[PDB]
Amino acid sequence: MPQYKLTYFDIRGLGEGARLIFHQAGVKFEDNRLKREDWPALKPKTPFGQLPLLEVDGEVLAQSAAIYRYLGRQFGLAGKTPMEEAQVDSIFDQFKDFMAELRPCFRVLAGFEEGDKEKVLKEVAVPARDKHLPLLEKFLAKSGSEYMVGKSVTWADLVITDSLASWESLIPDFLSGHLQLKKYIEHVRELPNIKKWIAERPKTPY
């Protein structure tokens, strides 16, 4: 019977991954969404000067992926064997590589930063998309099941599909050409607890 507090900004972003993992498992936690007002005071008190942070009975854990994995293993959403857990880690790291291409160009694409959206799409987004999506889809085809690894949902599934779904809003036809991913995203987000959470969670830009 452990007590959980997640500290992140109002947006979904990196924090949403943890939230999704809680709601899937049906585990209650404090969704501490932090006001911009309070960030300057908290920042120097954090391990690395950033959020998200997970508090577990007082103890602090930083870095989102470490948070995802910790929650995943605690809730049996990490894989049924040691090699499976690794395969889960593996596919998410590849997703992380993909994100490493896109995220630095997010704000120009969202319009928050001055720049040539059309250029970025052709010179950064669409090439990244074209390289990485086939690799995620290939991996997904190993399984034959509806998930990247195993016959049931894992934490990597929850975080990946949510992020891809959101990026579909910034980039038209982002998933066009990859229906196996489109189904995969449709499936995970139709899971009852996820489906519920998506309906109730705050509407934020990203």
Ligand X SMILES: N[C@@H](CCC(=O)N[C@@H](CS)C(=O)NCC(=O)O)C(=O)O
- Residues annotated within the binding site for glutathione are 8, 39, 43, 49-51, 63-64
Residue (of 171, 168, 174) closest to 118 by Cα position: 171
* Rounded Cα–Cα distance for residues 92 and 155 (Å): 9
Residues 6 or more apart in contact with residue 49 via CB below 8 angstroms: 43
119-158 positions binding its own copies, by CB under 8 A: 135, 138-139
- Provide, rounded to whole angstroms, the least separation between the CB of residue 55 and ligand X: 14
Give the pair of three-digit tokens for residue 123: 């010179």
Stated as kind and residue range, the H or E segment containing 54 is strand 53-56
Q: Which does 43 bind (CB under 5 to 8 A by kind): its own copies, ligand X, none?
A: ligand X
> Which residue, 103 or 187, has its beta carbon nearer to ligand X?
103
Asked if 72 interacts with ligand X (CB under 6 A), we say no
The distance from CA 153 to its chain's CA centroid, rounded to whole angstroms, is 14
Radius of gyration of the chain (CA): 17
Find the shortest distance in angstroms from Cβ 156 to its own copies.
Answer: 11
- Shorter beta-carbon distance to its own copies: residue 88 or 188: 88
| 165 part of the interface to its own copies, by CB under 8 A | no
Please list every residue from 44 through 103 that binds its own copies, using CB under 8 A. 47-49, 56, 59, 61-67, 69-70, 73-74, 82-83, 85-87, 89-90, 93-94, 97, 100
Answer whether 80's CB lies under 8 Å from 26's CB: no
Token digits for 14?
A: 């990196």
- Contact partner, 113, from ligand X, its own copies, none, Cβ < 5-8 Å per class: none
Beta carbon of residue 199, minimum distance to its own copies (angstroms, whole number)? 30
> 115 to each of 64, 101, 108, how far by Cα in Å?
29, 17, 6
Q: How far apart are CA 193 and CA 70, in angstroms?
A: 20
Q: Which residues bind ligand X (CB under 6 A)?
A: 13-14, 43, 49-52, 63-65, 93, 97
Residues that bind its own copies (CB under 8 A): 47-49, 56, 59, 61-67, 69-70, 73-74, 82-83, 85-87, 89-90, 93-94, 97, 100, 135, 138-139
